[PDB]
Amino acid sequence: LNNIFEPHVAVRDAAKMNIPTVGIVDTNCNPCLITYPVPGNDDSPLAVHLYCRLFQTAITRAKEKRQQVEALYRLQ
RNA sequence: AUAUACCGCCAUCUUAACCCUGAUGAAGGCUACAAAGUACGUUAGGUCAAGGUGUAGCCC
Numbered sequence: 664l665n666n667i668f669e670p671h672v673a674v675r676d677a678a679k680m681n682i683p684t685v686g687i688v689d690t691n692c693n694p695c696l697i698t699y700p701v702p703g704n705d706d707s708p709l710a711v712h713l714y715c716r717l718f719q720t721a722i723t724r725a726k727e728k729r730q731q732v733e734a735l736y737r738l739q
Numbered sequence: 740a741u742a743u744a745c746c747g748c749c750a751u752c753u754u755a756a757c758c759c760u761g762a763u764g765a766a767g768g769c770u771a772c773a774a775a776g777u778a779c780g781u782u783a784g785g786u787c788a789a790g791g792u793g794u795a796g797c798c799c
């Protein structure tokens with residue numbers, strides 16, 4: 664949601680550009696066009712910190728796994 | 740006599756695209772503590788005095 668409590672324009676624009684979206688949706692949000700919605704609280708700092716931690720950890724772990732797999736492929 | 744013959748000189752006037760919204764109707768698009776907006780000719784002109792090339796007139 665933007666600051667007028669309407670959807671972020673990027674949701675519709677990403678749908679137009681065929682870019683998948685992950686999103687945190689609160690009870691007053693519209694999840695119809697988010698590809699992978701995650702229902703949850705987006706206001707409490709604890710919750711937002713948990714989301715940031717999870718996504719950062721997943722991204723770094725995936726990138727490290729890619730590096731390890733390519734290294735194994737070349738070495739072996 | 741004619742630049743109301745040209746040339747010279749002066750002067751007069753004339754000389755987009757993309758992206759969104761509305762049911763992809765006519766149509767519309769701003770808020771900063773930010774909400775779709777971003778990129779030459781012309782003249783019955785003057786000048787025959789610091790300049791020219793022609794054309795015509797009269798020639799009891």
Ligand SMILES: [Mg+2]
Binds near residue numbers: 704
């Ligand atoms: Mg909320």
Ligand SMILES: [Mg+2]
Binds near residue numbers: 784
């Ligand atoms: Mg004249």
